[PDB]
Amino acid sequence: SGKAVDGNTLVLTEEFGLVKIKELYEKLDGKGRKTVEGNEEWTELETPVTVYGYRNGRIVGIKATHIYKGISSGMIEIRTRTGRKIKVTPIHKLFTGRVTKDGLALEEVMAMHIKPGDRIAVVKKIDGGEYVKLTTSPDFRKSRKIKVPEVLDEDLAEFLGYLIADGTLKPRTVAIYNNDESLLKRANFLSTKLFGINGKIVQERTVKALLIHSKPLVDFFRKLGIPESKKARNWKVPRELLLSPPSVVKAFINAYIVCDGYYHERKGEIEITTASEEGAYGLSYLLAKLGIYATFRKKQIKGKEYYRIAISGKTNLEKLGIKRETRGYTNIDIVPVEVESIYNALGRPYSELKGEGIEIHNYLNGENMTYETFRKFAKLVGLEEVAENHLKHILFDEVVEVKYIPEPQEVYDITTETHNFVGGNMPTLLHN
């Protein structure tokens, strides 16, 4: 076949949020002239959609002008240390990187040639965001019994964080469960501010609850895609949150973590365990809007499968305003850097590097340099811009396993001006 990805590959879009590329195809098929050539077809979209791509060291919105479907006789599945699992055609390209005296160069590598130990470009920061106006019917929308927020701001985002992490929706009641009565009071304050109605705090057998009795309010959250309970296995992050400014995402994430995130001392990581796999993948994209690289793992808990998102390591935690040493954390943000050639090209700044705690010899025999060490090194060798832009956005993630899968299937791709777009179960740079 051609260059393309498995239909379950997520893609971040402005118009539809984070969606499987096969779902995107089903939405867009027919909405433009299609050219068919045997096992390949291309649609030129009547209305281009917006995805995200990498350009000039940043990750910003870019137009996708075409969508492709092909039929492939086999696939390659790539797993990485962070928990990305990408399934693509053998000639589909990923990117490896090298930092030299001249900056960061991304190199295209076909999936058929990827091997364990390679490090592929993934996204740890997604730029952009605007305050999203909540979409209305052009019909006969608008409850008049409550006040309906019209912009997704930090207050609503905080409330959504409590509701998704620790809430239930019954047909006529919104509930938030927590043993901190001050958090329940805060949620009630927000409900008055946002919706003009409030609830009451009920002391229950093993937990307190804030109960807000309003069918219009339930309907508002259901239209947003809020799960009916913690255990919903199919809930998704709302598109409007993925398009929001980082301040809004931060309000949501902080609220989620206070409700159902847990800090593990020995490992140096905040863990979120959710029952929704696509909800977990969506959390990873939200975290990239904060500049955080999540890890992902499937876990067994009392005979059922759960999805663990970890915010791990001192650098990630700083992005939440948390200042903590994590000496038990294994570094996974490793920069491929040609240390010796850079050092010589810059005239061997031995004393200056020693002053930053770097002994150049410790990197001359293939040793890994962390991003944190590279930030310091870079300032002394003329590479600050690469450290503070390109490598603020791109992490080079270790491939742990590659497998050829000899099963034919339909595959999909999109066309962008950058020849790349952001997709995968956690944000990954995909070539087109």
Author numbering: -2 to 429
What does the paper say about this structure?
Inteins catalyze their removal from a host protein through protein splicing. The HINT domain catalyzes the protein splicing reaction, whereas HEN domains often function independently of the HINT domain. In this study, we elucidated crystal structures of HEN-associated archaeal inteins inserted at the same insertion site (VMA-b), which is located within the A subunit P-loop of the vascular-type ATP synthase (VMA) from Thermococcus litoralis (Tli) and Pyrococcus horikoshii (Pho). The two three-dimensional structures highlighted a modular architecture consisting of HINT, HEN, and an accessory domain (ACD).
Among VMA inteins inserted at the VMA-b insertion site, we could obtain crystals of the VMA intein from Thermococcus litoralis (Tli). The TliVMA intein comprises 429 residues and is larger than the PhoVMA intein (376 residues) but similar to the size of PI-SceI (454 residues). To prevent self-cleavages during protein production, we expressed both inteins in E. coli with alanine substitutions of the catalytic cysteines 1 (Cys1). We solved the structure of TliVMA intein at the 1.6 Å-resolution. The crystal structures of the TliVMA intein revealed a very similar overall structure as found in the PhoVMA intein, including the three-domain architecture known from the three other reported HEN-containing inteins. The HINT domain of the TliVMA intein also contains the β-strand extension found among thermophilic inteins. However, TliVMA intein probably carries a catalytically active HEN domain capable of binding to DNA and introducing DNA double-strand breaks. Indeed, we observed that TliVMA intein cleaved its reconstituted homing site accompanied by a strong DNA binding affinity as indicated by an electrophoretic mobility shift (EMSA) of the substrate- and product-DNA fragments. Our results demonstrated that the ACD in TliVMA intein induced a second cleavage site in addition to the theoretical homing site. The ACD of TliVMA intein strongly resembles the helix-turn-helix motif common for many DNA binding proteins, such as transcriptional regulator proteins.
